[PDB]
Design a protein around this ligand. Sequence first.
Ligand code: ZN
Ligand code: ZN
Length: 47
Amino acid sequence: IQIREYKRCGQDEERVRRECKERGERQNCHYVIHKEGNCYVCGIICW
Ligand SMILES: [Zn+2]
Ligand SMILES: [Zn+2]
């Protein structure tokens, strides 16, 4: 099992969330989005 994190700050929430979902989809893995204020961590989990 693997997890990679990608952080983005200063960007629009909907667009950052969409980037993450599509990242997970392209990789055929799973995503989560963890929000702290204006910063977002995209976690991509692959088995
Ligand atoms: Zn899976
Ligand atoms: Zn969270």
